[PDB]
Amino acid sequence: DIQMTQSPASLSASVGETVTITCRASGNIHNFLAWYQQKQGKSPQVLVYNAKTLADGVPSRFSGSGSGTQYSLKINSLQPEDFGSYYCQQFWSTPYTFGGGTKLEIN
């Protein structure tokens, strides 16, 4: 099984700032990576898939990068609605795994 290590576990930033969430896979996942955003009580929504493909309806503020085992999600110019939990997921090898999550709070 592939382990997904997401960092930082939590962070708080101000509106208009840039944040970077890193993800580390225990093995090569060949760019088969997805990023999700989850609002309190609500269901997760896909932000980025295939490591760098921006999902339909998602603002250009969100950008995914990386290859091999090191992947990143960047949020430029933070907006108030950006608060919530963020998760990475690998779909290269079964069983599919998610990162521990990153809790984002806005000030």
Partner: peptide, 8 residues
Amino acid sequence: PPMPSFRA
């Protein structure tokens, strides 16, 4: 479907 793996 789009797959960004040369192996795949």
